[PDB]
């Protein structure tokens, strides 16, 4: 019934060219590399190479072929997605991109000298929604590190594995009010939130306490690959050798936490700190990070594969934490102006989240003095002012 | 001559569809992702949206567009490549693949427990030639570590940076006749050859001695990416956390070499050993490794980019070393039967090289007791018996 509906949308011809069939199929934003339509793409190849004719659509083959992806095609082609007129949305995104390109900023990275090798004019924005509508511009294919942008993800790991009460037995859930590098605890001698460095160290201590570092990294990498829909998730070893021989404030924070005895029993501080460095050393592209902040923009389900990834409790908790203290000292101003859950990092990534609507990633090596990208902040302000 | 080339390609008809142009390119074995034809690919892209005819190539657009790759296109379309009749060559490869799939083998990996998680039935073969002709089958897209296969590459890098006399001031050029884990030196208290573990450690000690590991890894990764034509050269951190907590023979070998004072002056043993582990922990796919062993099959020129990577002296030296002692104690039998320069690996990769013709890669997790893949050895024997 969907093929005759599309024929009614068509100009009255039974046969339509495939190279024109892909048009108005990408106009709704659904890409041709979706694993949901992997059966559709392989059957389309099997029809395309073994015809030598072209301009062939057919109706009975289209009826008998797809039985589970019919609902996705009907939702996409009837403008039943969350965001219609996606060409206009991409036009707005491109206009905001060109407006934010005028800013200059500066001061990319003093410490972590491997991070200072990026040119200051790099700029890219990726967009991915709940249904699977995705679009990206700029330098979205260039890999970049996930410094401090993995902290909400690893907090979700800890919560979904061990229960929120056991997770918050060792950490608080309040904003610190100071820089993330500054070391101090609350009245109960605990880190203020998982987003600061001390809370990140403590929540790395929780994940899979009974196994070695290799199995821990394998588990978190496999699960994050499941969350990303098997996208590109690398590991920048060049930025891991740096920040290990040059990152001294994190070592001081870890030794302070060890001295304050706020660790789980039978835990080695040095190995946990090295594991935290390894988690900070993960690198993804902007397109790959568009799938990030979109599984948690949904109800814990992957926007592309639809698999069960995170429990809704973990997603709600990490969304609340990102809304509260996800932008260091700029969190209050960000909630005042933008009012959306977002996480930043010294690499230049912004994990902007719109709940139940869409996800977004912005990448810009220049940084503000508080540790946030100026171009991404201006882009977010323009986006919340326009839409 | 380009009109005459089109007259040779066509059968006499002026109208040639894009479907006819996109076929017989895979017959020539030149893939669409070649940066040499990147301007031709850009022409194809711009004429896919703007041709005003639909499924048409036209003579005049091809005349006015190709302005730097006339020689490559003319050599490709007149069967001037080193390997003609690529369909027969791929059929031979498929027959050898089916013959080698019958064997079982066993004994995947005992130590490095992260390496033991691979499936024993995984099997893939990738092929690339000097001109750029390539073909792959099986599991060619699954990444795997480059354990013991990066040693000729790092040896070539060290030779290119330093000079043969300065490289061999510390390392001999003779086979050992024992396993790579055996802890002994020659009469002059030196490692026997760069292929074994001690020689690999010493030649890692020589690359950029005055610079820390953070920029050394970036340097060697830049050279590897230039050799690979910007293909997928990843880093498996899971297999780097393992083999560091469990690799004990390498630590004993390094401490023995430090005691024998064969290291360069002012060199830390632990940091160089960690850098060696990092260099062994680099992971690639079968296709990306097939891009390798073709630059050194050529005179140091990358088959894909066409640039210059390695000096001919380094290429000749590493080819001679791989021919002499590139298969551990099985090197004599390999030269007796196959007689081609190949490098083995505990991961399962085989870096089979045919000089000035074509490069290869065979990937099989099961291993013989000597330290080589059984399926790869059988495949090499069948290949040298057939062609
Ligand atoms: N923003 C962070 O704290 C993580 C990255 C930072 N450079 C660090 O490791 O201290
Ligand atoms: N074949 C090998 O020896 C490589 C395994 C490990 N990298 C080692 O040096 O021992």
Question: Mind giving me the DSSP string for A313-349?
Answer: HHHHHHHHHHHHHTTGGGHHHHHHHT-S---B-TTSE
CB contact under 8 A, B113 and A234: no
The verdict on the CB of residue B109 being under 6 Å from ligand 2 is no
* Nearest CA-CA distance, residue B242 and chain A, Å: 6
Sheet holding B282-284, edge to edge: B144-145, B282-284, B233-235
Tally: H helices and E strands in chain B: 17, 8
Residues of B (257-296) whose Cβ lies below 8 Å from A: 278, 281
Residues of A (7-66) whose Cβ lies below 8 Å from B: 19, 52, 54
Tally: H helices and E strands in chain A: 17, 8
* Beta bridge partner(s), residue B127: B135, B360
B332 Cβ partners below 8 Å, 6+ apart? none
Angle at A332 between CA A328 and CA A336, to 5 degrees: 140
Q: Which two tokens stand for residue A176?
A: 């610190």
DSSP H or E segment with residue A126: strand A124-129
Measured CA to CA, the distance from residue A199 to residue A192 in angstroms comes to 7
The answer to whether A294 and A128 are in contact (CB under 8 A) is yes
Measured CA to CA, the distance from residue A236 to residue A112 in angstroms comes to 13
* Beta bridge partner(s), residue B358: B129, B354
Measured CA to CA, the distance from residue B321 to residue B36 in angstroms comes to 31
Closest-CA residue of B relative to A115 is B214
Q: How far is CA B166 from the centre of its chain?
A: 26
First to last CA, chain A: 36
Angle at A35 between CA A33 and CA A38, to 5 degrees: 80
B193 Cβ partners below 8 Å, 6+ apart? B171, B172, B173, B174, B175, B176, B199, B321, B324, B325
* Beta bridge partner(s), residue B235: B282
The answer to whether A133 and A304 are in contact (CB under 8 A) is no
Q: How far is CA B89 from CA B24, B93, B207, B337, in A?
A: 15, 6, 40, 21
CB contacts of A240 in chain B (<8 Å) are 237
Q: Which two tokens stand for residue B104?
A: 């079982």
CB contact under 8 A, B245 and A52: no
CA nearest B326: which of B153, B151, B195, B172? B195
Q: Within a 13 Å sphere around the CA of B70, how many CA atoms are in the beta-carbon half?
A: 10
Experimental method: cryo-EM
CB contacts of A218 in chain B (<8 Å) are 114, 117, 238
CA nearest A309: which of A328, A327, A294? A294
Measured CA to CA, the distance from residue B319 to residue B342 in angstroms comes to 9
Measured CA to CA, the distance from residue B191 to residue B202 in angstroms comes to 8
For residues B271, B274, B280, B281, the Cα torsion angle rounded to the nearest 10 degrees is -130
CA nearest A198: which of A110, A268, A283, A272? A272
Neighbours of B160 (CB within 10 A): 18
Q: Which two tokens stand for residue A111?
A: 């410490």
Q: Which ligand approaches the C-alpha of residue B250 most closely?
A: 2
Resolution (A): 3.3
Pocket of ligand 1 (CB under 6 A): A 112, 147-148, 180, 197, 243, 247, 249-250, 280, 345-346
* Beta bridge partner(s), residue A129: A358
* Nearest CA-CA distance, residue B71 and chain A, Å: 30
* Nearest CA-CA distance, residue A237 and chain B, Å: 7
The answer to whether B275 and B216 are in contact (CB under 8 A) is yes
Pairing of strands A349-350, A282-284: unpaired
Contacts 24+ apart (CB under 8 A), B28-32: B28/B76, B28/B77, B28/B81, B28/B86, B28/B133, B29/B81, B29/B83, B29/B86, B29/B129, B29/B132, B29/B133, B29/B134, B29/B135, B30/B76, B30/B132, B30/B133, B31/B134
Measured CA to CA, the distance from residue A21 to residue A17 in angstroms comes to 6
Measured CA to CA, the distance from residue A323 to residue A260 in angstroms comes to 29
CB contact under 8 A, B237 and A242: no
Q: How far is CA A223 from the centre of its chain?
A: 14
The answer to whether A203 and A167 are in contact (CB under 8 A) is yes
**For B266, phi and psi rounded to 5 degrees?**
65, 45
Measured CA to CA, the distance from residue B51 to residue B132 in angstroms comes to 29
Mark residue B374 as left, alpha or beta (left: phi above 0; alpha: psi -120 to 50; beta: remaining).
alpha
Measured CA to CA, the distance from residue B226 to residue B291 in angstroms comes to 11
């Amino acid at each position: 019934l969907e093929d005759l509906l599309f024929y009614t949308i068509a100009e009255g011809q039974e046969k339509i060219p495939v190279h024109k069939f892909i048009t108005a199929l990408k106009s709704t934003g659904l890409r041709t590399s979706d694993p949901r339509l992997k059966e559709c793409m392989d059957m389309l190849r099997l029809t395309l190479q073994t015809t030598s004719d072209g301009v062939m659509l057919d109706k009975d083959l289209f009826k008998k072929c797809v039985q589970s992806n019919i609902v996705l095609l009907t939702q996409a082609f009837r403008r039943k997605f969350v965001i219609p007129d996606f060409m206009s949305f991409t036009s707005h995104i491109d206009e905001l991109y060109e407006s934010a390109k005028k800013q200059s900023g500066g001061k990319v990275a003093d410490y972590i000298p491997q991070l200072a090798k990026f040119s200051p004019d790099l700029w890219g924005v990726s967009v991915c929604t709940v249904d699977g509508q995705r679009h990206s511009t700029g330098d979205t294919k260039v890999p970049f590190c996930l410094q401090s942008c993995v902290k909400p993800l690893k907090y979700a790991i800890a919560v979904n594995d061990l229960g929120t009460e056991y997770v918050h037995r060792y950490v608080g859930k309040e904003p610190s009010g100071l820089r993330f590098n500054k070391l101090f605890l609350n009245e109960d001698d605990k880190p203020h939130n998982p987003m600061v460095n001390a809370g990140a160290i403590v929540v790395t201590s929780l994940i899979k306490q009974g196994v070695n570092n290799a199995e821990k990294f394998d588990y978190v990498m496999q699960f994050l690959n499941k969350m990303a829909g098997n996208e590109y998730v690398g590991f920048s070893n060049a930025t891991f050798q740096s920040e290990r021989e040059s990152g001294d404030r994190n070592f001081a924070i870890g030794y302070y936490l060890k001295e304050k005895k706020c660790f789980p029993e039978g835990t080695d501080m040095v190995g946990i700190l090295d594991f935290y460095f390894q988690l900070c050393s993960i690198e993804v592209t902007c397109e790959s990070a568009s799938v990030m902040a979109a599984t948690l923009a949904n109800g814990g389900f992957c926007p592309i594969t639809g698999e069960r990834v995170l429990s809704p409790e973990a997603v709600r908790n990490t969304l609340s934490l990102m809304h509260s203290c996800g932008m260091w000292d700029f969190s209050g101003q960000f909630a005042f102006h933008v009012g959306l859950p977002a996480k930043s990092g010294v690499a230049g990534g912004i994990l902007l989240v719109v709940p139940n609507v869409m996800g977004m990633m912005c990448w810009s090596p220049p940084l503000d003095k508080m540790g946030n990208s100026v171009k991404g902040i201006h882009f977010c302000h323009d986006l919340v002012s326009l839409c």
